Swiss-Prot record:
Residues 2-6 are annotated as: Critical for glycosaminoglycan, lipid A, lysozyme and DNA binding. Residues 3-4 are annotated as: Important for full bactericidal and antifungal activities. It comes from Homo sapiens. Residues 28-33 are annotated as: Involved in glycosaminoglycan binding. Residues 21-28, 39-40 are annotated as: Interaction with PspA. Disulfide bonds join 10-46, 20-37. Residues 21-31 are annotated as: Interaction with lipopolysaccharide. It comes from the Eukaryota. Residues 2-11, 21-31 are annotated as: Bactericidal and antifungal activity. The record marks 5, 14 as: Interaction with PspA. This is Lactoferricin-H.
Length: 49
């Protein structure tokens, strides 16, 4: 979509969402690893098994 149904959806847990969103913003000055996992909800996020 174009609203929030592209990052804010199956996102039941934010401890993983926010982080991969804030960390992603902090990882510019501090953290150095690459982890883009917020706007994605592949069968590894939306689906917990």
């Amino acid at each position: 979509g174009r609203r929030r149904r592209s990052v804010q959806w199956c996102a039941v847990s934010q401890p993983e969402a926010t982080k991969c969103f804030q960390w992603q913003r902090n990882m510019r000055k501090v953290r150095g690893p690459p982890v883009s996992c917020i706007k994605r909800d592949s069968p590894i996020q939306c689906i917990q098994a």
